[PDB]
Amino acid sequence: WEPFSLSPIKDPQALHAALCSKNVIPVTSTLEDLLPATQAQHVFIKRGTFHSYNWTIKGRSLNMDRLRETCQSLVDRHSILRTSFVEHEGHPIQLVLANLDVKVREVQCWPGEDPMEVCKALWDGKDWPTLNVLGGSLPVRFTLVSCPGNEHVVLTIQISHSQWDGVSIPKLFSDFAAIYNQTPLPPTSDFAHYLYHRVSSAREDVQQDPTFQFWRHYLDGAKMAVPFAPGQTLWTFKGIVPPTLPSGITMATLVKAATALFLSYHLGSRDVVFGHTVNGRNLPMDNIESLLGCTLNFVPLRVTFPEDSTDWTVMDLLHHTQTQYTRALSHEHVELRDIFQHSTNWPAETPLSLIVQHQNIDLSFSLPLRGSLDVQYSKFARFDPLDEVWIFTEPHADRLEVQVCANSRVLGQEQATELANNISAIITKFSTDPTARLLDIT
Amino acid sequence: WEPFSLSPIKDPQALHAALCSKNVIPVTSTLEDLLPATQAQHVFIKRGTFHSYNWTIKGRSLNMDRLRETCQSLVDRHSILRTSFVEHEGHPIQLVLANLDVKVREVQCWPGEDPMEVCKALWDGKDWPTLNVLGGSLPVRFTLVSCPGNEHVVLTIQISHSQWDGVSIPKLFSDFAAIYNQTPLPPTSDFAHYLYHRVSSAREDVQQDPTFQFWRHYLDGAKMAVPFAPGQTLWTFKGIVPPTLPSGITMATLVKAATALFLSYHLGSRDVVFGHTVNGRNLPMDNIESLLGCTLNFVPLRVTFPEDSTDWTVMDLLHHTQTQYTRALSHEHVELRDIFQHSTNWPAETPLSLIVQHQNIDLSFSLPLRGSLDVQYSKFARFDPLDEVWIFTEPHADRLEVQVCANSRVLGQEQATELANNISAIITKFSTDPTARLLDIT
Amino acid sequence: EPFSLSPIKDPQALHAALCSKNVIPVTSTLEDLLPATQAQHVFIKRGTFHSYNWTIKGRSLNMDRLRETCQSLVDRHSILRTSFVEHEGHPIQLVLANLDVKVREVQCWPGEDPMEVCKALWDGKDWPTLNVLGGSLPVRFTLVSCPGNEHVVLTIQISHSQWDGVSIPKLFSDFAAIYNQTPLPPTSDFAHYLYHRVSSAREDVQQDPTFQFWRHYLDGAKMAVPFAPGQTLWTFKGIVPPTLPSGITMATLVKAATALFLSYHLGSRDVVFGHTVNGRNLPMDNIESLLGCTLNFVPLRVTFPEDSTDWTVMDLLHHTQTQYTRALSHEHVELRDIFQHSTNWPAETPLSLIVQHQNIDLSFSLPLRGSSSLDVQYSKFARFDPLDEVWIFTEPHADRLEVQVCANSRVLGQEQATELANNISAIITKFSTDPTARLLDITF
Amino acid sequence: EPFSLSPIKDPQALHAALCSKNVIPVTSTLEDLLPATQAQHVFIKRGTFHSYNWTIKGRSLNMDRLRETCQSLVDRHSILRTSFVEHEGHPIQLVLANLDVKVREVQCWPGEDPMEVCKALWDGKDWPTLNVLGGSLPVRFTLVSCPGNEHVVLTIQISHSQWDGVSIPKLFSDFAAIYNQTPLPPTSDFAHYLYHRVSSAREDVQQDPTFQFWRHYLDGAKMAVPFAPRASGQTLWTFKGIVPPTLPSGITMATLVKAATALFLSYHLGSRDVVFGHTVNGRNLPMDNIESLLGCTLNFVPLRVTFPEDSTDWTVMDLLHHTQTQYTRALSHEHVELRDIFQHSTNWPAETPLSLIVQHQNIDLSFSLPLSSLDVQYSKFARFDPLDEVWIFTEPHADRLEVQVCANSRVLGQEQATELANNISAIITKFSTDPTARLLDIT
């Protein structure tokens, strides 16, 4: 937990010096740590995942210098916000900077000119097209666009998905609002400190790590299906009515199960492995629930159907699926390539090809600044998958939304559209008779 | 075994008389039998499988009136060549005609004009674009195209793949040559007789039926993978050095096992079902081996891998594959939709989605007409698969040739090309160390 | 005469060279050897190629006689025995003799339509491999029969370098006559036409009344030139058959409409453009009934006077007709000769707009007769692919005058071609309706 | 004087309507209201829109003074405070007064480029949403800065209906002068120009010498008319440089260009009497400061070139002299509306458009805005989308004469445009190399 002792590079201060030299980061900045970048961070960075969270603030009481100051303080409190991402010596790494001055990009618009249209212009015109996270310049930056009277302002926060996740992003907002409202905040832990905790929980002799033994056992016997080799990102949507969840059964479990029966039909298998997304926050850590970073992980989820004389109800799969999740809670946090390297005979660089992600997170957002201020949320976002298929479930109050995201070369529009409906129809089926033997709908 | 004993319609001699008035068949023809069209026959008809077998004849000794006579003689001999195909009362059926006068289409070319070029023009111009087998006009027809001296003549025989297969097509040529050479031929059984023999061979009760008992146990607890969502017929080729065959092993086994390993990686299955072509000539009747028609069958082939605690050599697989074939010999001749209806849960109209066909048949062809004459073979062919992928293998002297044929929407050129290279690669690996245990591919 | 117009020293050793490559029959003789006209090379360069098809249904039909008719008709029309070649880039006619005609014959399956067979041969090989300047004989016969020979198709293939509108019906009346052994008059070779054209030429050109006419005719004229420009397009617009003012011909009315279209677009009061003439005003004998391509494509100059002169449609009309009638005696000479002898223009200057009024037979016959009675219907297959030029064809049927524009899509796009056809249509009809109007027409 | 020429009964209720829609500032006055000229309306229908970009790199820069220079300049030039609209069918200028200029300002991130930002705004919203006839003031300023104000890009946006080649350098020199607080000799409106044109015109139109000159000038003429051509289509620019032409004694570079075209046209049209469009500066009116006032006084008028019959044996020199006087003859008459030329002096439809316009760029091709020491570099962004017409522009740089062709790809395909540029180019060179040649000449 002593700084610079997880660096894969030995003169870390000299990599700092060079970025400064190159005017890639501020030259008055200090290097307060240097750690490996995680697999899940790289997943995002490699997919150009980049957000611009925008807050349209209207009202007479807005304090502009305080807005500016809040940005600085937000960054002082969250070291993930002070982090540069770089590859050095074949190592993907993150650099924690301190003594970091935040400078807001400001725009005083012409009369009648819409603040948001200006942001959308900066965004489309240079902000994401020239995005180069691995060049080492901070992804996290602020923009202030104000009509002339300052009674209609848009504040934006740009950030790489390597720096937040669904559980902690709301904490970024409430922190910001609290800092602007002058509400004292409790001290917090860094994403770096999560990394060090991951590492302290590991044995130096891998064959003695309960985690990598659990995975070796969880996965012994198993074979993961591999798509036959495969140009734009495609998002495809299907809404259903929110399905009834028998006691003990998580909505996530439903989706993970409905996918497994889909994959059992289409593969010739009763032993399917596919990727799903875990929050990575089931560690014995202080602040684990609140710290800001990307502790999300993408891990193997094995669903196993019985020989077949066994007359499984839907419910039998439901409980089994859940167990194939909950079994791994204390082991869900390791690097995916580690699991492959230590618990399997699979190439460690083996990619997941399908990734199921249920969104049991906040689906609406809030930034309650005080005077009276109307504050409205919107975002811009990029996300470009490689060869994998993402299935996203969003549990709203009116609907579950099945979302498929994949490159068109991996899954064409009609394939995407069918996969949506197939997964939905099964979720529904599981909901309409959890009792039925698995002899359904296809 | 009486005629019409297998007709699924009740007035056969009136469907006949209907066709004659629509001028679909010769009015002076007689209807001798009427039977169900085989499932595999329909496979080809549905795919517009149509050949023009072309014989280029050069020499001074040619008897034109004898060539014409021989065409007629050949049709009197083989009833499948006297068969019209129609659909009626929801039923796919085949009408056997007699008192059928064979009329040749004849072309007297201009000096300098190439008869083959004329053939090609009629082929691409009308013959195959207007092809409508199920309308009920005879698929089998002859064309004679002559340079003015009758010393360069192309003879042409058209035919649906529903009326021949790989083993019996040479019989058609050899008989043709015998007839023209006035060489006496022995009595031959008809394709119909083949069908009457399948019925006699079966019991009226189905679980009772040992063939459907053997499949039920062959396919018990088996799951056959189903491709995701369903352009142009694309043919794709890769030829390798003819692999060496360990003692006991057929080339067909080497290919079938290479496909199973391939599908076991991609499906993450130890239990793979896929389609494959059998000659369907293991029934014991007289002339089974020599009768003209399509007795090809497409049937499930199941390959089962053990846990790798067993540690299979390649050889263990080869032997298992071969055995998963040889087991079904006495049962391989039944309708596929019957196998599904009677031995499985599976929907009976379940399509094979992959079909592996090893061409252990004649690959070169001869028509030794006598005077001296030069007689050269060539062909025109149509074939348009549906949603399935065919893998064909041709064991020539200088190369094993792997050939993939599928619609481009089912499998795109880049993929097809990879499939070809991959299967070839596994075949080749199987050949250079049959003893190796399962690793390394591909 | 023969061979006096041969642009090669050894004709017989070009014929032998061809016989030796199996381009023409080995038993054939070379009987004349002349230049192909400029008009002939126009059609050849555009791959202009026709299959004239006769559907014959009936009991009394004599296949053997049909075959002989083919041979004899070719016998009497030397253009039908002509093969085309280039030798020093300047295409020539080899007239053949001792020419055995061999019909291509098809006996169809029962049920097989004979026309579909012909059509398949046409698209499958006959035109796609056409190579007239290779030397093989363009004129060739096909006979496709249903098995009882009571329904046949006869097809005559031919290059447009071997026929024109006025003489094609002769080919049909001759065929029918030969078959019925009805007696026929004697007739002239197309080659006779060529010889006659030259006979009337002056041995030196600045003296030739023809090239003197053309010099005066085009004196002052500038012919407009398209700016730089891949499929042949045909575009049609039918209008009510126009009323013709007294003395004014239909063709004149079409050509005046165009002239006016052009003067407006060019902002010119003196337009020159191409138009087709029949080339059969030469006073030779049997001029109007021989068989070949006597067509010529020549300049038509239309000069509008200043606006103070106050011209009526009628004035434009008479002048237009006059600008045609004036050239009758001189319209038969090579265009490239008109240019180099009578003007300042490059000899190889192409005509870029060609107006052709079809004042010829538009429907045809083959009264084969038969010993019960033969029913013979006409139809045809045709290729024609313009180069950089635009054609305007008018077609005067009973119920419509069909304005036809043909031109490569790269030259005149579909929507322009539609506008051209419509505009020319409108001007015409507008002329018909009020011939006394002043040239203050609305139109565009 | 003000509100003369106003083609609407109630001008101030049109300024009212605009203000109560926040199209223009509520606190602004309607100082004048006039017709928009035909040439102005040409540029507007074609979306002609410029951003003039000054990159200032230096120590001494005064940001507050920059803002104010913006204000003063707009005060000085009434065309800069003009808004454009279409009422009663026809497009008109509203001149505004008591108009406060609001500069758009951007303080960039560290290491973020000012110009990349302007560019982003330009393509992101500035031109794609342009709507001049909607009434918003097309003239508007932008200042984008690096965080120490030692690096700034000022931009000026403007419609081509507000400037032309002779007066744009004035805009720049006036700005610098204001910035530097160098005093300035007063100037006239663009509005002054309009009021003058009406003053010098006669009221019985058949009595106006201008329209008698044009009637006589175009007497007997027919202008050729394009055929169609249609197919959307893209604006193409095509360039061909040639060696700067040696000029024959007494002949200008512009005559050289227009004679080449005439010769090109007479050949393709097969015509000895050709009429085509060409651009005049419109600054020959005798008026105070005609040469300095800021606006678009440009006009597009007929140039008629008449070749005699061959027996006359014209030389290239004859064509050059004739062509030049076909221009100098019209100098005093060049300032009237094209549509008025056609209505009053010909029998051609008044709304007849020119289909070919030649414009010789005998104006400044480089620019300046000179303010420790400030380094001030020029660049620009620009839109322009022609309709059915073809433009030919010639640009007389030191190393090359640039023949530029502009026309929608539907009117002239890339291939034709390239050939046009090469043909005209080649004719110019030929004329230059052998001006005594007879017009019966080779390539």
Ligand SMILES: CCCCCCCCOCCOCCOCCOCCO
């Ligand atoms: C056979 C149709 C499958 C459609 C392709 C879906 C595109 C991406 O899917 C990724 C999931 O991959 C796991 C499934 O593996 C299938 C392997 O198929 C090989 C049989 O040829």
Ligand SMILES: CCCCCCCCOCCOCCOCCOCCO
């Ligand atoms: C994968 C390329 C498509 C090849 C054509 C079909 C080949 C027939 O093999 C069937 C086995 O394929 C399994 C289907 O895979 C579906 C699972 O993935 C679909 C969505 O993730």
Ligand SMILES: CCCCCCCCOCCOCCOCCOCCO
């Ligand atoms: C840069 C403008 C080009 C100059 C005008 C050229 C117009 C050519 O004169 C037309 C005479 O040509 C008649 C035949 O052209 C048919 C092509 O039509 C295509 C477009 O008009």
Ligand SMILES: CCCCCCCCOCCOCCOCCOCCO
């Ligand atoms: C010549 C191709 C179009 C070039 C762009 C338009 C140039 C405008 O110049 C107009 C002068 O051309 C008028 C002549 O147009 C020819 C009309 O007749 C051709 C037959 O359609």
